[PDB]
Design a protein around this ligand. Sequence first.
Ligand SMILES: *Cc1c(COP(=O)(O)O)cnc(C)c1O
Ligand SMILES: *Cc1c(COP(=O)(O)O)cnc(C)c1O
Lengths: 396, 396
Amino acid sequence: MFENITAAPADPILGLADLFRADERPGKINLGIGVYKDETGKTPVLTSVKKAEQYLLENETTKNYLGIDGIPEFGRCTQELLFGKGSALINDKRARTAQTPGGTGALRVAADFLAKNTSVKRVWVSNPSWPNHKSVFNSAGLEVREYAYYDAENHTLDFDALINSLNEAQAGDVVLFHGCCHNPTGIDPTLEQWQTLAQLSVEKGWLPLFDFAFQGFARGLEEDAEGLRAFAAMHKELIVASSYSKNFGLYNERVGACTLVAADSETVDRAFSQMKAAIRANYSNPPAHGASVVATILSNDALRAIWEQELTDMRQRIQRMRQLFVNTLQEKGANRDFSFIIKQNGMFSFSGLTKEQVLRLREEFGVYAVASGRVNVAGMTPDNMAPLCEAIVAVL
Amino acid sequence: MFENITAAPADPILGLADLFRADERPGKINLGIGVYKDETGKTPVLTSVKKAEQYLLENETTKNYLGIDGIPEFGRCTQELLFGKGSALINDKRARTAQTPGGTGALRVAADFLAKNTSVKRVWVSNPSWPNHKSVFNSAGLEVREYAYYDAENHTLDFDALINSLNEAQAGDVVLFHGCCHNPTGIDPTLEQWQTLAQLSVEKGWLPLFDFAFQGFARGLEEDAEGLRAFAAMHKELIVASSYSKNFGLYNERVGACTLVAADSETVDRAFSQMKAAIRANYSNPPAHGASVVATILSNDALRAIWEQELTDMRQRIQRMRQLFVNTLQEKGANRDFSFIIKQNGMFSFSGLTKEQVLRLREEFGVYAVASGRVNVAGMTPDNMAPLCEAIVAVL
Ligand SMILES: *Cc1c(COP(=O)(O)O)cnc(C)c1O
Ligand SMILES: *Cc1c(COP(=O)(O)O)cnc(C)c1O
């Protein structure tokens, strides 16, 4: 059966984690997958999730299966976070959320759902976007089309072009948005652009699918939610695939959410019984540990307060590394002005490096970066700043 | 978009857990989902997994993403368990295993894999089988066909009919087998039938897909693996979807395995790079907690010894409840001979009850059973035995 199955390509982000692992050089530097590291270049488990696990160890009685949609407290907390405490989507019982295995699991459950219970034929993703977006919607049966987004000469969002591009998406089509910290560019819409974009979506009949994986990483929890809340206010229907991997440092426990919203209580509940059927034909019901940890921190005032300080510490450490990086590239003789990266939000820098400069940096300096030129600023510490900056200048 | 999406049917097993939850009667009894309960009708978290979690709490340093296939130690331990320590599939590096979100996740990753990288059009499942089998392969794009299995008058496996049925499956087709504790019948093949079945599979060119979810629940860990090992010895290719939900009482942590085997090292590795690509387009990489717990117990002698005693305690408690149940139905005036259930292996009893007796037992006695007549003997305690037996006799 398996004789002429040919080898799949390496995953553009996960394939690097493998190559990095196999390298033997003592000074190599990672800069690839979006995982946060602290001042010491370690990825610690947050104190607040560690307190939550101790509690879960003392207080669990069973490992008996959760329902298809996960922990109720988990989806209620998620709706508060995404839409505001006492939102009208919450109060009119317009939103239903299933607990999924990460935000990727949320993107596929949504895909599956739409592919099997909707007229959708086409999802619209930005150019550039997360590499795996194309792969999840194509597995579902959906076609991926791209829209204009980034002006690379100017290092800005090209809103006119983004409008004109999207001008050929039909009514019935899904349009994917990043909630905040666009991946890979780091450039987000303004509030005024998000609302212009919200009102155009509705006069054209696009169903919005938000990928919200970095809430708390651009300006704050709530501030980062404004764009989505501006869409929630205009729209009868939305689906948001959200994650807790980064903002909770809970990467390998796989914890996210697919929250579905329709015009009313009856429609949302009927639409969700099909979403729960897609889940049951895939992994059946979700992993408890990580999601019980989120629910515990979010449920407890003391434990929530510790967590928000932790996430504030992470936004601030990335912001200092971002500034450090353009400062050191300048005084290391960078033969280009790199201060546009000061303006990007998130864990990353979309540096401008070509595929072959990126290739040469791993092959002879051992600094690993994604081939789109995307580098992880949260992977930068004061201790490896001068080494990677010296490497970059040597290839420019 | 969502206006005319109609409601999905209730899941035949999970829908009952919901109905049970909503019932208000103080004496209701569950008997539906296959979850083990102890003498007190509780589903405890095993002492050995509780010791493993304490250790993981002391000793973890990060929640950083696992690779697409999970924990290496986890897949190596899984191969020992499934095929024998020092097996030639292990020694010739013929087997590769991905860590999945339960055995359902393993069944779908396999489905996805085959649907996208193989000529397979049709999976063959027994009649009766696990209700969700049909649902996972149909989501993948695969057709489900059924083969003959159980003689209901005689309460036996009808091997002639099972042979003749399967006589119209072509070369290239998948045939699903249950490793041990057939669900729902509890009737397994003999060693002699498993080997007859193994040698027929190979002269006909069926690819075997084993669902192995109850290892340790019929006779012992190793004894329960004989059938699969008899197939492993004849076959160049196999795929086994295995679970640790029941034998580790780790139901909601979602822990299982899809292990793939090809004719040699090169083919298996090339076939697995595509299997890892199907995973990445679905939930991306697996939940660590449950799988790190399995790997820890299986890696440690002290902790392994405690676990095997625990699983031995569970096989034995179900065997005493099985015997109790036919004894009490007889002295409660059962108007049928029920001692064929003494012979079935596993958590269940395929009782013979019709859909309307099963319906009437939940509607006026509140004992919940699956509508195929399947009742969970591991849900029976000495304290609810007489109540449910009295209920059953009243409906016969
Ligand atoms: C991280 C991320 C996801 C998925 O998050 P996980 O929780 O790790 O699955 C999806 N899309 C984007 C853009 C992300 O950054
Ligand atoms: C339990 C079971 C599965 C899946 O096991 P999980 O680990 O709970 O996903 C698959 N098939 C059968 C027959 C089972 O009993």
